[PDB]
Amino acid sequence: MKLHELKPSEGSRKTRNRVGRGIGSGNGKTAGKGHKGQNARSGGGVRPGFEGGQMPLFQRLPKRGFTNINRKEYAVVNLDKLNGFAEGTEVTPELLLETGVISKLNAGVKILGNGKLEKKLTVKANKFSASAKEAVEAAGGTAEVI
Amino acid sequence: PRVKGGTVTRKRRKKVLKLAKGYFGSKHTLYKVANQQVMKSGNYAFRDRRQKKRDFRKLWITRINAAARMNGLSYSRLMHGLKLSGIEVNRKMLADLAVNDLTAFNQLADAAKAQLN
Amino acid sequence: PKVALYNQNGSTAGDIELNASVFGIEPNESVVFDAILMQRASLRQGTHKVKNRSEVRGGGRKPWRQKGTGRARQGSIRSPQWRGGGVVFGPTPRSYSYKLPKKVRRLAIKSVLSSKVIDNNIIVLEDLTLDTAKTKEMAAILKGLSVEKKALIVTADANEAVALSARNIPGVTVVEANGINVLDVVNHEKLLITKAAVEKVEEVL
RNA sequence: GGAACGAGGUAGAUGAAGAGGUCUGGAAAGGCCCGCCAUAGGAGGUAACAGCCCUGUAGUCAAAACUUCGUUCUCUCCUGA
RNA sequence: GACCGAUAGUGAACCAGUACCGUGAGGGAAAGGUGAAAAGCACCCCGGAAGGGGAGUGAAAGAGAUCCUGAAACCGUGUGCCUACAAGUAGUCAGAGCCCGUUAACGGGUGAUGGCGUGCCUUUUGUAGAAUGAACCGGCGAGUUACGAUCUCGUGCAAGGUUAAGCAGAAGAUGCGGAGCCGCAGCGAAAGCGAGUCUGAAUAGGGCGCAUGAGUACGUGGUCGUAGACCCGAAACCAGGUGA
RNA sequence: AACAGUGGUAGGAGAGCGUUCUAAGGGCUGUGAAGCCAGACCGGAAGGACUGGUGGAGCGCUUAGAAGUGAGAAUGCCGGU
């Protein structure tokens, strides 16, 4: 471009809305707040969760359950995304790691089948059995479960 | 950056003050009263622009009434006879011109008298 | 794209086909615009400040009572409405810079220096050796290549004779091959460059 | 505790090139027609808007006397399985 | 320095913590500009002097000592048209007579007489109000910024988007840094199972989910939350001191 | 082109005028800059010319970009009358 013939992309900029400058524009005297709703009244109004005084829905419904310290989350890999490694080849958590198929390796790799599979490979996943007992047979064996 | 801005105020007020020339006393000197007078004058001008159309027809009708009474008729009978005879579509304004310069007004009067029977 | 070839002052007939991927792509104006705006900001200091209502050297007591005398109720004599009070809101010290994803930067620089090619505003040289640091020699060389307005000069070896000369001429600017960015390329019309710097530029990106 | 070298701080020195002609003006740094210097077109003055009018700038240099660091020498200090 | 320019910026551009106020601790102002150079008005006239009228200096004396430019309220002198039988929010519409000539235009000034016509703002179901506010003129005076959520629009890249601190680089652009963050799978309190799961002997049902696939980094706008948070406005509470 | 429509408070949506600073480029002033004062010009509005006087050195245009962004009222603050 040239620094004088400079033009933005259409529809990416809007001008601000200055409020309280004359009556011909709207938002003229009361600045768009009307005769106040106790929040337009000086001070702030009411607390967000406040309902004007009532046993709150959040304070009414009971709270249930306990969290567990030893909670284990695996990295999920479905059958379809496995179908990019061609024939033969070895599949190991590190090889999946430095490719982008999985972004992190918390706990272990758990492959469970939801899509289609072709070719024949060798799978070495933590899981518990390399598959949710539906991709074991889908992988036609070759399932190193360690 | 800081913005001072005085000339804009001076110009905007001087325009109104120049628009309020000829008013009585301080109404042509001080800004606050001159502003109010100017706004009232605008409202009045609109209303009177309608009213002048209202009030010229009345004068027209009165002059026609006098001239017709000079001939032995009334305004209402003359108008009925004119609209009834040969559909003279002449309005009231040209009728008054023909009244103030008559001997042509009378011809239309006998034209109406002919059809009134 | 091939774009002829010149010597310190010699026609030296020739040509150098440049990497299309770098000198032939279709420019994106919607990217150059925000690249320019981002680069122009972050050049500002933003060292400004006004006195608050509570920072003005002044009084906490109230000037008079609230009843008995006919006068508007007033607290501090340093309130925003009094002559000599504090400034409500107003300029405050802060930063203006921000960041863009890297691929956008790569696209912007490519687009600008590929649009320079369309208008025949690129001259590629060879060697560019100065025996001495005289300002006369640089002016003679610039005149020999029909350069009138501003002109960027890009080298690769961090020459000291080229940097010392042409640093007093009020239009020219000398930079290293790594220092090229959008503003000086779009703000200098003509663009001189050495083939040795061409290789570095088209090998980094 | 001493003795020699080096770099600084507290004062300074040197430093290129137009009175160009002409017009209007109280007064040219301005207009028009011509030239030069530049590792120096950063600034401030001068009767109006100056790279070539003045103080200056870029570069090079500087200290009797107090001080701030650095290096080396002198100089002190006796073991480990 | 996309900071101020004499009501701004320090309380203070000037013999300012001064002058003033208080027994005391303490509070706390106003006030910039002759001219390039004093070349700062010899001499004459009126006057007790102050102050003028000439004559001189200067580019300018209407530049002559709070001496650059110099607006408005306010106070005067001269003059063209009206005015001493008239009931008026003071204008607007219609209209003779008189006096003039323009950014030449179905022009300018003043106006005997006729018609219509209860100021402005605020607040209320409702105001000409005998409901509130303003003597007049000038200057100053109120929706901002930082950090988080959520939505639309424009980009970049997309089942992959995107680096923080830090190190080099004019307080710059940029280069390298893959720690970390958000997505692609869900259900259950959990162990745990997986496009399936949870209650249930089961099978019927789930705010369930898939079937039925778009997010992410940055930017401009609209809202919300925490900070004084749109501007002004109490009585009171606590801590340390000064006074018979 | 043809049909249809155009009262408006709280409030929602859209399109615009002016001010100060920054970036581009371009151009204007001592043969007279800004400011000030008149007039019988132009635009739908917010506004913008032209001409004359005063003044005695500055100022505008186009396209972007930032914001201490526009005053008739607060028994508002300061000054003059």
mmCIF file of all heavy atoms in Angstrom, chain A residues 14-17 19 23-27 31-32, chain E residues 152 221-223, chain F residues 9-16:
data_model
loop_
_atom_site.group_PDB
_atom_site.id
_atom_site.type_symbol
_atom_site.label_atom_id
_atom_site.label_comp_id
_atom_site.label_asym_id
_atom_site.label_seq_id
_atom_site.Cartn_x
_atom_site.Cartn_y
_atom_site.Cartn_z
ATOM 1 N N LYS A 14 -15.788 -0.415 14.295
ATOM 2 C CA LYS A 14 -16.958 0.373 14.626
ATOM 3 C C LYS A 14 -16.532 1.536 15.502
ATOM 4 O O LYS A 14 -15.584 1.427 16.280
ATOM 5 C CB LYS A 14 -18.011 -0.447 15.356
ATOM 6 C CG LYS A 14 -18.669 -1.514 14.521
ATOM 7 C CD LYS A 14 -20.019 -1.877 15.101
ATOM 8 C CE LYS A 14 -20.450 -3.253 14.645
ATOM 9 N NZ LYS A 14 -19.622 -4.314 15.277
ATOM 10 N N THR A 15 -17.238 2.651 15.373
ATOM 11 C CA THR A 15 -16.962 3.795 16.224
ATOM 12 C C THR A 15 -17.621 3.612 17.583
ATOM 13 O O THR A 15 -18.682 2.997 17.707
ATOM 14 C CB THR A 15 -17.457 5.089 15.583
ATOM 15 O OG1 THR A 15 -18.867 5.212 15.786
ATOM 16 C CG2 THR A 15 -17.164 5.086 14.101
ATOM 17 N N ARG A 16 -16.978 4.164 18.605
ATOM 18 C CA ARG A 16 -17.477 4.063 19.963
ATOM 19 C C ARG A 16 -18.828 4.761 20.086
ATOM 20 O O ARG A 16 -19.313 5.415 19.162
ATOM 21 C CB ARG A 16 -16.472 4.669 20.937
ATOM 22 C CG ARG A 16 -16.846 4.506 22.387
ATOM 23 C CD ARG A 16 -15.825 5.175 23.282
ATOM 24 N NE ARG A 16 -14.518 4.538 23.195
ATOM 25 C CZ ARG A 16 -14.166 3.466 23.889
ATOM 26 N NH1 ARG A 16 -15.009 2.873 24.718
ATOM 27 N NH2 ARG A 16 -12.939 2.974 23.747
ATOM 28 N N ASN A 17 -19.441 4.616 21.253
ATOM 29 C CA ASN A 17 -20.747 5.199 21.539
ATOM 30 C C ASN A 17 -20.600 6.114 22.746
ATOM 31 O O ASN A 17 -20.655 5.662 23.889
ATOM 32 C CB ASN A 17 -21.765 4.124 21.793
ATOM 33 C CG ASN A 17 -23.131 4.683 22.059
ATOM 34 O OD1 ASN A 17 -23.564 5.622 21.399
ATOM 35 N ND2 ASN A 17 -23.822 4.117 23.035
ATOM 36 N N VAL A 19 -21.893 8.709 25.358
ATOM 37 C CA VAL A 19 -23.210 8.801 25.965
ATOM 38 C C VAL A 19 -23.275 10.062 26.811
ATOM 39 O O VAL A 19 -22.319 10.398 27.516
ATOM 40 C CB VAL A 19 -23.499 7.537 26.796
ATOM 41 C CG1 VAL A 19 -24.797 7.654 27.530
ATOM 42 C CG2 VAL A 19 -23.503 6.321 25.910
ATOM 43 N N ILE A 23 -29.298 15.955 23.296
ATOM 44 C CA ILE A 23 -30.552 15.210 23.245
ATOM 45 C C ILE A 23 -30.904 14.709 21.857
ATOM 46 O O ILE A 23 -31.843 13.911 21.727
ATOM 47 C CB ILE A 23 -31.723 16.059 23.771
ATOM 48 C CG1 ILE A 23 -32.030 17.176 22.781
ATOM 49 C CG2 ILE A 23 -31.396 16.623 25.128
ATOM 50 C CD1 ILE A 23 -33.381 17.797 22.964
ATOM 51 N N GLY A 24 -30.206 15.146 20.826
ATOM 52 C CA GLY A 24 -30.578 14.751 19.489
ATOM 53 C C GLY A 24 -30.133 13.379 19.067
ATOM 54 O O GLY A 24 -30.480 12.939 17.970
ATOM 55 N N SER A 25 -29.383 12.676 19.906
ATOM 56 C CA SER A 25 -28.802 11.396 19.544
ATOM 57 C C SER A 25 -29.411 10.218 20.286
ATOM 58 O O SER A 25 -29.060 9.075 19.989
ATOM 59 C CB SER A 25 -27.297 11.422 19.805
ATOM 60 O OG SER A 25 -27.035 11.638 21.175
ATOM 61 N N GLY A 26 -30.303 10.458 21.238
ATOM 62 C CA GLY A 26 -30.676 9.417 22.171
ATOM 63 C C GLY A 26 -29.604 9.327 23.233
ATOM 64 O O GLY A 26 -28.502 9.838 23.025
ATOM 65 N N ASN A 27 -29.894 8.692 24.364
ATOM 66 C CA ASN A 27 -28.957 8.666 25.486
ATOM 67 C C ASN A 27 -28.549 10.080 25.876
ATOM 68 O O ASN A 27 -27.386 10.356 26.167
ATOM 69 C CB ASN A 27 -27.722 7.829 25.164
ATOM 70 C CG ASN A 27 -28.038 6.616 24.339
ATOM 71 O OD1 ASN A 27 -29.053 5.958 24.542
ATOM 72 N ND2 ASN A 27 -27.163 6.305 23.397
ATOM 73 N N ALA A 31 -28.653 9.273 29.978
ATOM 74 C CA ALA A 31 -27.554 8.420 29.544
ATOM 75 C C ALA A 31 -27.980 6.979 29.291
ATOM 76 O O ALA A 31 -27.151 6.071 29.349
ATOM 77 C CB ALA A 31 -26.406 8.456 30.551
ATOM 78 N N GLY A 32 -29.250 6.744 28.993
ATOM 79 C CA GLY A 32 -29.713 5.412 28.680
ATOM 80 C C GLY A 32 -30.099 4.554 29.861
ATOM 81 O O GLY A 32 -30.342 3.358 29.678
ATOM 82 P P U E 152 -22.236 -15.633 18.624
ATOM 83 O OP1 U E 152 -23.204 -16.476 17.890
ATOM 84 O OP2 U E 152 -20.860 -16.124 18.850
ATOM 85 O "O5'" U E 152 -22.157 -14.237 17.865
ATOM 86 C "C5'" U E 152 -23.306 -13.694 17.236
ATOM 87 C "C4'" U E 152 -23.066 -12.302 16.707
ATOM 88 O "O4'" U E 152 -22.489 -11.466 17.738
ATOM 89 C "C3'" U E 152 -22.095 -12.168 15.549
ATOM 90 O "O3'" U E 152 -22.670 -12.507 14.301
ATOM 91 C "C2'" U E 152 -21.688 -10.706 15.637
ATOM 92 O "O2'" U E 152 -22.697 -9.879 15.083
ATOM 93 C "C1'" U E 152 -21.665 -10.483 17.148
ATOM 94 N N1 U E 152 -20.302 -10.579 17.713
ATOM 95 C C2 U E 152 -19.421 -9.556 17.446
ATOM 96 O O2 U E 152 -19.707 -8.592 16.767
ATOM 97 N N3 U E 152 -18.178 -9.696 17.994
ATOM 98 C C4 U E 152 -17.734 -10.731 18.772
ATOM 99 O O4 U E 152 -16.583 -10.712 19.196
ATOM 100 C C5 U E 152 -18.700 -11.750 19.008
ATOM 101 C C6 U E 152 -19.920 -11.641 18.486
ATOM 102 P P G E 221 -13.386 -0.100 20.039
ATOM 103 O OP1 G E 221 -13.122 1.299 20.421
ATOM 104 O OP2 G E 221 -13.307 -1.140 21.082
ATOM 105 O "O5'" G E 221 -14.819 -0.158 19.351
ATOM 106 C "C5'" G E 221 -15.997 -0.047 20.124
ATOM 107 C "C4'" G E 221 -17.149 -0.813 19.524
ATOM 108 O "O4'" G E 221 -16.682 -2.040 18.907
ATOM 109 C "C3'" G E 221 -18.188 -1.282 20.521
ATOM 110 O "O3'" G E 221 -19.082 -0.256 20.902
ATOM 111 C "C2'" G E 221 -18.843 -2.446 19.796
ATOM 112 O "O2'" G E 221 -19.764 -1.972 18.827
ATOM 113 C "C1'" G E 221 -17.648 -3.059 19.069
ATOM 114 N N9 G E 221 -17.038 -4.163 19.832
ATOM 115 C C8 G E 221 -15.754 -4.178 20.294
ATOM 116 N N7 G E 221 -15.448 -5.260 20.939
ATOM 117 C C5 G E 221 -16.599 -6.019 20.896
ATOM 118 C C6 G E 221 -16.853 -7.299 21.439
ATOM 119 O O6 G E 221 -16.078 -8.023 22.068
ATOM 120 N N1 G E 221 -18.146 -7.729 21.183
ATOM 121 C C2 G E 221 -19.072 -6.999 20.493
ATOM 122 N N2 G E 221 -20.271 -7.572 20.345
ATOM 123 N N3 G E 221 -18.847 -5.799 19.980
ATOM 124 C C4 G E 221 -17.593 -5.364 20.216
ATOM 125 P P G E 222 -19.251 0.113 22.451
ATOM 126 O OP1 G E 222 -19.644 1.530 22.562
ATOM 127 O OP2 G E 222 -18.046 -0.354 23.163
ATOM 128 O "O5'" G E 222 -20.482 -0.780 22.904
ATOM 129 C "C5'" G E 222 -21.493 -1.126 21.972
ATOM 130 C "C4'" G E 222 -22.399 -2.203 22.506
ATOM 131 O "O4'" G E 222 -21.970 -3.505 22.042
ATOM 132 C "C3'" G E 222 -22.444 -2.358 24.011
ATOM 133 O "O3'" G E 222 -23.244 -1.371 24.634
ATOM 134 C "C2'" G E 222 -22.971 -3.778 24.175
ATOM 135 O "O2'" G E 222 -24.374 -3.809 23.981
ATOM 136 C "C1'" G E 222 -22.314 -4.486 22.993
ATOM 137 N N9 G E 222 -21.107 -5.238 23.377
ATOM 138 C C8 G E 222 -19.802 -4.853 23.253
ATOM 139 N N7 G E 222 -18.964 -5.755 23.674
ATOM 140 C C5 G E 222 -19.763 -6.801 24.096
ATOM 141 C C6 G E 222 -19.426 -8.054 24.659
ATOM 142 O O6 G E 222 -18.315 -8.528 24.897
ATOM 143 N N1 G E 222 -20.544 -8.815 24.941
ATOM 144 C C2 G E 222 -21.827 -8.416 24.721
ATOM 145 N N2 G E 222 -22.772 -9.289 25.067
ATOM 146 N N3 G E 222 -22.161 -7.252 24.206
ATOM 147 C C4 G E 222 -21.084 -6.498 23.917
ATOM 148 P P U E 223 -23.181 -1.159 26.221
ATOM 149 O OP1 U E 223 -24.148 -0.105 26.587
ATOM 150 O OP2 U E 223 -21.769 -1.006 26.626
ATOM 151 O "O5'" U E 223 -23.723 -2.535 26.794
ATOM 152 C "C5'" U E 223 -23.988 -2.705 28.171
ATOM 153 C "C4'" U E 223 -24.213 -4.153 28.505
ATOM 154 O "O4'" U E 223 -23.497 -4.992 27.567
ATOM 155 C "C3'" U E 223 -23.694 -4.586 29.857
ATOM 156 O "O3'" U E 223 -24.584 -4.257 30.903
ATOM 157 C "C2'" U E 223 -23.479 -6.079 29.675
ATOM 158 O "O2'" U E 223 -24.707 -6.774 29.776
ATOM 159 C "C1'" U E 223 -23.016 -6.142 28.222
ATOM 160 N N1 U E 223 -21.544 -6.170 28.086
ATOM 161 C C2 U E 223 -20.860 -7.316 28.421
ATOM 162 O O2 U E 223 -21.400 -8.311 28.852
ATOM 163 N N3 U E 223 -19.506 -7.261 28.252
ATOM 164 C C4 U E 223 -18.791 -6.190 27.775
ATOM 165 O O4 U E 223 -17.569 -6.268 27.665
ATOM 166 C C5 U E 223 -19.571 -5.049 27.439
ATOM 167 C C6 U E 223 -20.887 -5.080 27.598
ATOM 168 P P U F 9 -39.634 11.061 20.990
ATOM 169 O OP1 U F 9 -38.416 11.894 21.041
ATOM 170 O OP2 U F 9 -39.540 9.722 20.379
ATOM 171 O "O5'" U F 9 -40.185 10.929 22.476
ATOM 172 C "C5'" U F 9 -40.050 11.997 23.401
ATOM 173 C "C4'" U F 9 -40.263 11.547 24.824
ATOM 174 O "O4'" U F 9 -41.618 11.070 24.988
ATOM 175 C "C3'" U F 9 -39.403 10.394 25.311
ATOM 176 O "O3'" U F 9 -38.112 10.811 25.715
ATOM 177 C "C2'" U F 9 -40.230 9.823 26.455
ATOM 178 O "O2'" U F 9 -40.055 10.601 27.626
ATOM 179 C "C1'" U F 9 -41.654 10.042 25.951
ATOM 180 N N1 U F 9 -42.256 8.836 25.342
ATOM 181 C C2 U F 9 -42.621 7.788 26.154
ATOM 182 O O2 U F 9 -42.457 7.774 27.356
ATOM 183 N N3 U F 9 -43.187 6.727 25.508
ATOM 184 C C4 U F 9 -43.430 6.608 24.169
ATOM 185 O O4 U F 9 -43.947 5.582 23.743
ATOM 186 C C5 U F 9 -43.037 7.731 23.397
ATOM 187 C C6 U F 9 -42.483 8.779 23.997
ATOM 188 P P A F 10 -36.865 9.804 25.677
ATOM 189 O OP1 A F 10 -35.726 10.496 26.303
ATOM 190 O OP2 A F 10 -36.706 9.251 24.317
ATOM 191 O "O5'" A F 10 -37.271 8.632 26.666
ATOM 192 C "C5'" A F 10 -37.107 8.771 28.069
ATOM 193 C "C4'" A F 10 -37.340 7.466 28.787
ATOM 194 O "O4'" A F 10 -38.665 6.972 28.477
ATOM 195 C "C3'" A F 10 -36.423 6.323 28.400
ATOM 196 O "O3'" A F 10 -35.177 6.373 29.063
ATOM 197 C "C2'" A F 10 -37.248 5.100 28.761
ATOM 198 O "O2'" A F 10 -37.211 4.885 30.160
ATOM 199 C "C1'" A F 10 -38.652 5.567 28.403
ATOM 200 N N9 A F 10 -39.065 5.166 27.046
ATOM 201 C C8 A F 10 -39.330 6.011 26.010
ATOM 202 N N7 A F 10 -39.700 5.407 24.916
ATOM 203 C C5 A F 10 -39.684 4.072 25.255
ATOM 204 C C6 A F 10 -39.983 2.928 24.515
ATOM 205 N N6 A F 10 -40.366 2.953 23.241
ATOM 206 N N1 A F 10 -39.873 1.745 25.134
ATOM 207 C C2 A F 10 -39.490 1.729 26.410
ATOM 208 N N3 A F 10 -39.183 2.740 27.211
ATOM 209 C C4 A F 10 -39.302 3.903 26.566
ATOM 210 P P G F 11 -33.809 6.363 28.229
ATOM 211 O OP1 G F 11 -32.729 6.087 29.190
ATOM 212 O OP2 G F 11 -33.741 7.585 27.405
ATOM 213 O "O5'" G F 11 -33.942 5.102 27.268
ATOM 214 C "C5'" G F 11 -33.865 3.785 27.783
ATOM 215 C "C4'" G F 11 -34.384 2.757 26.808
ATOM 216 O "O4'" G F 11 -35.685 3.139 26.300
ATOM 217 C "C3'" G F 11 -33.577 2.535 25.549
ATOM 218 O "O3'" G F 11 -32.392 1.793 25.757
ATOM 219 C "C2'" G F 11 -34.588 1.837 24.654
ATOM 220 O "O2'" G F 11 -34.761 0.492 25.059
ATOM 221 C "C1'" G F 11 -35.861 2.595 25.007
ATOM 222 N N9 G F 11 -36.132 3.675 24.042
ATOM 223 C C8 G F 11 -36.006 5.020 24.231
ATOM 224 N N7 G F 11 -36.318 5.710 23.173
ATOM 225 C C5 G F 11 -36.664 4.765 22.224
ATOM 226 C C6 G F 11 -37.084 4.915 20.882
ATOM 227 O O6 G F 11 -37.251 5.956 20.247
ATOM 228 N N1 G F 11 -37.344 3.704 20.267
ATOM 229 C C2 G F 11 -37.198 2.500 20.885
ATOM 230 N N2 G F 11 -37.486 1.427 20.148
ATOM 231 N N3 G F 11 -36.804 2.342 22.130
ATOM 232 C C4 G F 11 -36.553 3.509 22.744
ATOM 233 P P G F 12 -31.146 1.975 24.762
ATOM 234 O OP1 G F 12 -29.950 1.404 25.407
ATOM 235 O OP2 G F 12 -31.116 3.376 24.301
ATOM 236 O "O5'" G F 12 -31.517 1.074 23.509
ATOM 237 C "C5'" G F 12 -31.500 -0.341 23.593
ATOM 238 C "C4'" G F 12 -31.975 -0.978 22.313
ATOM 239 O "O4'" G F 12 -33.295 -0.485 21.963
ATOM 240 C "C3'" G F 12 -31.158 -0.694 21.071
ATOM 241 O "O3'" G F 12 -29.956 -1.433 21.002
ATOM 242 C "C2'" G F 12 -32.149 -1.018 19.967
ATOM 243 O "O2'" G F 12 -32.316 -2.420 19.848
ATOM 244 C "C1'" G F 12 -33.431 -0.444 20.557
ATOM 245 N N9 G F 12 -33.630 0.955 20.143
ATOM 246 C C8 G F 12 -33.420 2.049 20.931
ATOM 247 N N7 G F 12 -33.654 3.172 20.327
ATOM 248 C C5 G F 12 -34.045 2.799 19.059
ATOM 249 C C6 G F 12 -34.422 3.604 17.964
ATOM 250 O O6 G F 12 -34.489 4.833 17.924
ATOM 251 N N1 G F 12 -34.751 2.853 16.849
ATOM 252 C C2 G F 12 -34.709 1.490 16.805
ATOM 253 N N2 G F 12 -35.058 0.936 15.642
ATOM 254 N N3 G F 12 -34.354 0.726 17.821
ATOM 255 C C4 G F 12 -34.036 1.437 18.917
ATOM 256 P P A F 13 -28.666 -0.792 20.297
ATOM 257 O OP1 A F 13 -27.546 -1.751 20.388
ATOM 258 O OP2 A F 13 -28.487 0.575 20.825
ATOM 259 O "O5'" A F 13 -29.081 -0.680 18.766
ATOM 260 C "C5'" A F 13 -29.172 -1.839 17.959
ATOM 261 C "C4'" A F 13 -29.723 -1.540 16.588
ATOM 262 O "O4'" A F 13 -30.968 -0.805 16.693
ATOM 263 C "C3'" A F 13 -28.886 -0.655 15.691
ATOM 264 O "O3'" A F 13 -27.754 -1.286 15.130
ATOM 265 C "C2'" A F 13 -29.912 -0.203 14.672
ATOM 266 O "O2'" A F 13 -30.255 -1.274 13.811
ATOM 267 C "C1'" A F 13 -31.102 0.055 15.580
ATOM 268 N N9 A F 13 -31.099 1.446 16.052
ATOM 269 C C8 A F 13 -30.785 1.902 17.298
ATOM 270 N N7 A F 13 -30.859 3.200 17.406
ATOM 271 C C5 A F 13 -31.240 3.624 16.146
ATOM 272 C C6 A F 13 -31.489 4.896 15.616
ATOM 273 N N6 A F 13 -31.384 6.014 16.326
ATOM 274 N N1 A F 13 -31.851 4.990 14.323
ATOM 275 C C2 A F 13 -31.951 3.857 13.622
ATOM 276 N N3 A F 13 -31.743 2.603 14.010
ATOM 277 C C4 A F 13 -31.385 2.554 15.299
ATOM 278 P P G F 14 -26.441 -0.412 14.853
ATOM 279 O OP1 G F 14 -25.378 -1.313 14.364
ATOM 280 O OP2 G F 14 -26.205 0.410 16.057
ATOM 281 O "O5'" G F 14 -26.858 0.559 13.662
ATOM 282 C "C5'" G F 14 -26.968 0.073 12.334
ATOM 283 C "C4'" G F 14 -27.478 1.120 11.373
ATOM 284 O "O4'" G F 14 -28.573 1.862 11.958
ATOM 285 C "C3'" G F 14 -26.505 2.206 10.960
ATOM 286 O "O3'" G F 14 -25.559 1.775 10.003
ATOM 287 C "C2'" G F 14 -27.438 3.287 10.440
ATOM 288 O "O2'" G F 14 -27.910 2.954 9.145
ATOM 289 C "C1'" G F 14 -28.607 3.165 11.411
ATOM 290 N N9 G F 14 -28.532 4.154 12.497
ATOM 291 C C8 G F 14 -28.167 3.915 13.789
ATOM 292 N N7 G F 14 -28.202 4.980 14.530
ATOM 293 C C5 G F 14 -28.619 5.980 13.676
ATOM 294 C C6 G F 14 -28.836 7.352 13.926
ATOM 295 O O6 G F 14 -28.702 7.955 14.990
ATOM 296 N N1 G F 14 -29.253 8.030 12.793
ATOM 297 C C2 G F 14 -29.433 7.453 11.570
ATOM 298 N N2 G F 14 -29.840 8.272 10.594
ATOM 299 N N3 G F 14 -29.234 6.169 11.324
ATOM 300 C C4 G F 14 -28.829 5.491 12.415
ATOM 301 P P A F 15 -24.131 2.497 9.908
ATOM 302 O OP1 A F 15 -23.337 1.791 8.882
ATOM 303 O OP2 A F 15 -23.605 2.642 11.283
ATOM 304 O "O5'" A F 15 -24.463 3.947 9.340
ATOM 305 C "C5'" A F 15 -24.889 4.122 7.998
ATOM 306 C "C4'" A F 15 -25.311 5.544 7.723
ATOM 307 O "O4'" A F 15 -26.278 5.972 8.712
ATOM 308 C "C3'" A F 15 -24.225 6.601 7.805
ATOM 309 O "O3'" A F 15 -23.411 6.650 6.647
ATOM 310 C "C2'" A F 15 -25.023 7.874 8.046
ATOM 311 O "O2'" A F 15 -25.596 8.337 6.836
ATOM 312 C "C1'" A F 15 -26.154 7.360 8.933
ATOM 313 N N9 A F 15 -25.905 7.595 10.365
ATOM 314 C C8 A F 15 -25.413 6.710 11.279
ATOM 315 N N7 A F 15 -25.314 7.200 12.485
ATOM 316 C C5 A F 15 -25.777 8.495 12.357
ATOM 317 C C6 A F 15 -25.924 9.538 13.276
ATOM 318 N N6 A F 15 -25.607 9.425 14.560
ATOM 319 N N1 A F 15 -26.411 10.716 12.845
ATOM 320 C C2 A F 15 -26.726 10.817 11.556
ATOM 321 N N3 A F 15 -26.636 9.908 10.593
ATOM 322 C C4 A F 15 -26.148 8.752 11.062
ATOM 323 P P G F 16 -21.963 7.341 6.713
ATOM 324 O OP1 G F 16 -21.241 7.038 5.459
ATOM 325 O OP2 G F 16 -21.341 6.992 8.008
ATOM 326 O "O5'" G F 16 -22.290 8.897 6.717
ATOM 327 C "C5'" G F 16 -21.509 9.809 7.474
ATOM 328 C "C4'" G F 16 -22.297 11.043 7.819
ATOM 329 O "O4'" G F 16 -23.281 10.728 8.835
ATOM 330 C "C3'" G F 16 -21.514 12.193 8.421
ATOM 331 O "O3'" G F 16 -20.813 12.953 7.454
ATOM 332 C "C2'" G F 16 -22.596 12.973 9.145
ATOM 333 O "O2'" G F 16 -23.362 13.721 8.216
ATOM 334 C "C1'" G F 16 -23.474 11.843 9.674
ATOM 335 N N9 G F 16 -23.123 11.461 11.052
ATOM 336 C C8 G F 16 -22.669 10.243 11.473
ATOM 337 N N7 G F 16 -22.449 10.197 12.752
ATOM 338 C C5 G F 16 -22.784 11.459 13.205
ATOM 339 C C6 G F 16 -22.750 12.005 14.507
ATOM 340 O O6 G F 16 -22.411 11.459 15.557
ATOM 341 N N1 G F 16 -23.171 13.320 14.528
ATOM 342 C C2 G F 16 -23.569 14.017 13.426
ATOM 343 N N2 G F 16 -23.943 15.282 13.631
ATOM 344 N N3 G F 16 -23.605 13.524 12.209
ATOM 345 C C4 G F 16 -23.201 12.247 12.170
#
